[PDB]
Amino acid sequence: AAATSLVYDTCYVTLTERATTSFQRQSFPTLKGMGDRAFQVVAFTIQGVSAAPLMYNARLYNPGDTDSVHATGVQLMGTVPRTVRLTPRVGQNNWFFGNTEEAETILAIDGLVSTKGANAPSNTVIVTGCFRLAPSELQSS
């Protein structure tokens, strides 16, 4: 019997008006280089500052889905950091197997503007994931 580990990884980014920013396995330091060991999304924390009015929407993906099974819903962005926590419930947190490709999408954050055609002001978003890890699937000699 080998106990499950728990880790917090974190990348960040600047959002773009009519675009979606993808956070894949490679986006999270530890997950990117931990090797062949499965993992699961426990919770995600999203902090966000924008120089001017601006919205976003963080969406959690299940492994191999073409679209997100969970989301935070549009969030406003002020000139001050504001945090939102996304938590998957049953059926929104299937485990990603050990060999999940580096480019696999985990969390995607859409950028949105309320005035047609407008462009996103300066803005930053810090995304922190909380993941469980099953035992390493080691190689024999």
Task: State the DSSP code for 92.
Answer: S
Task: Give whichever of 76 and 103 is closer to a copy of itself, judged by the CB atom.
Answer: 76
Least separation in angstroms between residue 4's CB and a copy of itself is 8
CB 89 within 8 A of CB 34: no
In the chain, the amino acid numbered 32 is K
Q: What is the sign of the dihedral through the CA atoms of 104, 17, 44 and 125?
A: positive
Task: Give whichever of 22 and 95 is closer to a copy of itself, judged by the CB atom.
Answer: 95
Q: Which residues pair with 108 in a beta bridge?
A: 22, 59
Q: How far apart are CA 89 and CA 86, in angstroms?
A: 10
Q: How far apart are CA 2 and CA 101, in angstroms?
A: 24
Least separation in angstroms between residue 58's CB and a copy of itself is 10
Task: Give whichever of 106 and 125 is closer to a copy of itself, judged by the CB atom.
Answer: 125
Least separation in angstroms between residue 54's CB and a copy of itself is 7
SS3 label, residue 29: helix
Least separation in angstroms between residue 14's CB and a copy of itself is 4
Task: Give whichever of 99 and 103 is closer to a copy of itself, judged by the CB atom.
Answer: 99
